[PDB]
Ligand binder design. Structure first.
Ligand SMILES: [Ca+2]
Ligand SMILES: [Cl-]
Ligand SMILES: [Cl-]
Ligand SMILES: [Cl-]
Ligand SMILES: [Cl-]
Ligand SMILES: [Fe+2]
Ligand SMILES: [Fe+2]
Ligand SMILES: [Fe+2]
Ligand SMILES: [Fe+2]
Lengths: 355, 356, 359, 359
């Protein structure tokens, strides 16, 4: 168990940006700018800084050239400058390695703390950031597939209850989860900003970054991304979807960048800001929990995820999940799922749905 | 074995107009088509339900007829003039097909009508006269989040596509898109009268069988809603394939299964084909974007399962086996192949379907 | 000027519901349930309790039969039970009339405080509420015009800065406003929940309630409401829109219920939850500030609003605005607006945009 | 009355393109290409050739530099090369001036006939055209406001019945019209391709060109054009809309190019291809006939339209309408409109709907 510090938790506003190490900057730029339409906040020969349509902070995504593609930092904005001090004291009490840079790690961020958190993830906490032109009414720039906000992150970690309790202590509230009757937890979603998630835990070998998610305004914007990828003859980089999620109720798509970093496109989840927001638990065998339409979840979605770095920039060693595998219990040889609980019609045994 | 072109002039066909489907439980079928899908009842009794789409003014687009064996009974096309029903009768007689003409129609809301057993074993109807009903196109008080606005097309399973294609072209259908390979095989063709990608289409397989009937929505989110509704009704297992973007036709689509496994496509936003030199588009059968533009795999049931069709006595037509190569086998079977980019091994699939 | 209490402000989560007095319950039910598709939580011969598609608290709207159509209460949910005590102490320090009921004023609300606030508005603060089936995935019920959330209120008050200062002390943060070059404020929007607004102030004679706003998922859902109103041959109850707002950037529509209570339908504003969220100030003469496409603002939008009640159920006396009128300075016979600041081309003098004058 | 020729009518497929004369080619290019996103088939110092997303013929719009902005030709594609001969013979029998160019009037069109038609309009008929890359799946190019098709033209002409008969003889079928109870026709819509219209007649002084219409896939695409015009601070070039039409049931928008040529953006009308398609007749006083939501029709919509040229390139003289004016009888001083037939409630006397009067 990760104990609760006596030091007060930092007041976390939201997920704010991710720094991804990429191997070929120009190829990554083509994907995130030319295909996906993110907006350039700064670039040079080593980094590209990108933001979504409605953002006013400096960036939502930093692409950093490096030898090994990996998550370098998942950053959360905190409410006040003093909250960076709180974060430092909190993680120090947890016994975690921390690094404070009063002038930031990346451009357009000021005083910032990076930590190797108890689950092995590189978290950053910052308040100070350079404001930029908020493009929310720049419809002269608006793409048919426009990405409008950074929505969340999703982390692969072996022991979901352990991570959950740690995030709850940090002030994240669980909105949805997936469990079975035997008591295993397979996934949880948790928030600060009053949407279904800011970060999420997916049971698996970790620490690995499952995905970063961006929002669109409407469902047709997501469709357009798929349509554009077909036109560019990169439909093989569409991993899963588009679909309606069970968990979150959002319309979604998963796609793969040039280093196989997974990006979710997402819209139209619901408000979770009330403190007694009802928590929704789905059964792992419910074939509408992930895709509400019952489309099968391809195995790669369960098994593949990005490396993460420590504060020296080396790859974090991975810890194998010992709890039951969601893949194995649903679509593996001894797995099953149902459409209607208790009905063998519309159930799937030892394979996935739809055929 | 080639179907000759008649001396007799072809009838001037306007469009696909309605299908008569035999169903086994009229109440279960009513629940699907009316309560789930929202089609509008023009007339019903204890034996039949007459249904129309939101923008239709002719009596119906779908007749559900209770019967012992679920099947297609008639696929009907409307012709331009009452004289065109005469033309149709002379045309099919010269083809040596069985015909039956009724001056007062075979179903309610249709007048003088010709039914035929066509050269591919399908029950075609041709009619002009039909009872006009209230066009509900501005009845936004009734409009469903999933509203089906038009009948768009039919799709027929037949073993020899080129043979069927020539016959439909002589009848005045123009081919808009097709799927072929590098070895002389045709796997599918789409052909039209009304200036959309199709009014009917041919899918290579054992036949005659009816592959599907397609209805249009206004917008893509209407199709998404049908999927969402089916999830809420906990009948997502009746979603067969999709939603997706087609390669062929460029339409947004969904395939669902009614209670007798009759396949319904929901469809929107294909393109205009009414110019007589409309460019024909041919896809290679191994192109993994040809059916679903996003490269999502086509489930085997889509290729193997289709509805029975009846002859004019109401008996099931015998199924003739396809001997040409199978689209399923050559793309997703154990010796199958598909590509994302022609000539690129990366994003290609050997002996398996796309996406894992 | 309204002083800042020493007592701490209650921690307000969001707007939560309004209680509207309506004169004919059956006609109001037809509007809100049959036309708009809101979901019934409870009803009887006296009241109808309604919620939006994604709501889990008991209701977003209470329709209460009474003799005089009016706003009876604008209710905000607070973070904890103890925040209701805080609300009570805060408004007592302000010298406002308060009434506390441990078992609520309306069904499905528990311990609740109502106040006649400094601007004359009946505010409620509550934490306790009866949870109901959250209908967010009930696509078997989902209509083509589905109202998915309660988004905000908008209040007519004569002195906007006075009201704004008071709301800021309550914890609301201003997101956008409308001003002129000579220091007059015409409107302000302010939030708790991290959207553009939870309540807003429109300059005018008050206290009156300008509107209550509900969200849709998508723009087409708003279009459908218009389409449906056309099919029902009640297009005369479409007051204004549909449009794209300047302020808020939301897609919008304003419609009128059977007692002329104004309802806004709204979608796709932006996130405001960061504490240094950039405020946006528009010039009153900017013809894209209200409708981004430049469509004229109908004069009834500026002049008409609902009565509000005091805690005895009597109508609050109206105080006249003395600051300049937005209607007069933009679309009246001495008014003007521009498309491009400083450009005579695309400017309008003594009339509204698009070729119309006031009727 | 225009007689029906003995000579057979050409078989017309559809509206195909317009040639518009523009005064400043770079300005016009900025509008059609940079604002609206049309695709360039060809250009030089004198002309720009543009097509929609789904087109395979060479172009849907030709912009031709000249001294006087005007419609130079409205072009219809015919079914066969032999139909161009039929057109020549048909119009010659009608007593009309004709000009035949075996290699076309504009690039990418072959054998073509231009005519000064009986209503004074420059019509072109052609079959031969250079095919180009059909961009219908080029989602790498697809704009958020993408114009996917050319849909129709709309002509202003003083005597609608006279024009309607002539177009019916040419094979167009009337889908909808607007009349009153005193024998006046104010407008008619008529088709060949199986949509509500390929061309239409609007009562007024003429010949003038009312608009050219392009379609989008979905309603949000039209919304985006408005939004973009707001961002470019050219909302003054949005004339009317967006709305839902009564006539056609389409979602619509009217905008004005740099020479005040009016462009409609349009989506989701219905299928008219059956020969007994029911003809819908709206009453001119029905306030849902033009905008289904009851929004008022701006006076410029009724009064302003583009000049048209003769075959010499000179402007056609305008003949005044003597039949009653739709503007006058609906929104003018002695005008009337209703929301519900026979109901005074929701009716408008001597002014426009929604609280406006003529400027
Ligand atoms: Ca009259
Ligand atoms: Cl999922
Ligand atoms: Cl397909
Ligand atoms: Cl406004
Ligand atoms: Cl109109
Ligand atoms: Fe996610
Ligand atoms: Fe189909
Ligand atoms: Fe509002
Ligand atoms: Fe038009």
């Amino acid at each position: 168990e990760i104990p609760k510090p006596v030091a007060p938790a930092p007041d976390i506003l939201r997920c704010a940006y991710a720094e991804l190490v990429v191997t070929d900057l120009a190829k990554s730029r083509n994907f995130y700018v030319d295909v996906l339409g993110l907006h350039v906040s700064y670039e040079d020969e080593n980094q590209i800084y990108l933001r979504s349509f409605e953002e006013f902070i400096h960036h939502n995504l930093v692409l950093t050239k490096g030898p090994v593609a990996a998550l370098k930092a998942m950053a959360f904005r905190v409410r006040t400058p003093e909250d960076v001090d709180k974060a430092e004291a909190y993680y120090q009490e947890l016994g975690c390695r921390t690094e404070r840079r009063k002038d930031g790690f990346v451009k357009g961020i000021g005083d910032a703390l990076r930590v190797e958190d108890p689950l092995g993830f590189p978290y950053e906490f910052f308040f100070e950031t350079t404001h930029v032109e908020r493009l929310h009414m720049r419809y002269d720039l608006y793409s048919a597939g426009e990405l409008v906000r950074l929505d969340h992150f999703n982390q692969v970690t072996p022991d979901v209850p352990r991570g959950r309790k740690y995030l709850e202590d940090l002030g994240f509230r669980v909105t949805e989860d997936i469990q079975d009757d035997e008591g295993t937890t397979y996934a949880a979603w948790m928030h600060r900003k009053g949407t279904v998630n800011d970060t999420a835990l997916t049971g698996g070998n970790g620490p690995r970054l499952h995905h970063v998610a961006f929002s669109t305004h409407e469902k047709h914007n997501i469709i357009q991304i798929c349509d554009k990828m077909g036109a560019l003859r990169i439909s093989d980089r569409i991993e899963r979807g588009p679909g309606r999620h069970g968990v979150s109720n959002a319309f979604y798509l998963y796609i793969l960048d040039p280093d196989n970093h997974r990006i979710e496109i997402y819209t139209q989840d619901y408000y979770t800001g009330d403190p007694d927001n009802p928590t929704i638990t789905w059964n792992v065998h419910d074939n509408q929990r992930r895709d509400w339409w019952g489309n099968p979840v391809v195995p790669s979605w369960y098994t593949e995820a990005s490396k993460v770095l420590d504060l020296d920039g080396n790859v974090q060693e991975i810890i194998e999940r010992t709890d039951d595998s969601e893949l194995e219990v649903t679509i593996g040889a001894d797995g099953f799922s149902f459409t209607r609980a208790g009905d063998e019609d519309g159930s799937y045994h030892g394979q996935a749905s739809k055929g």
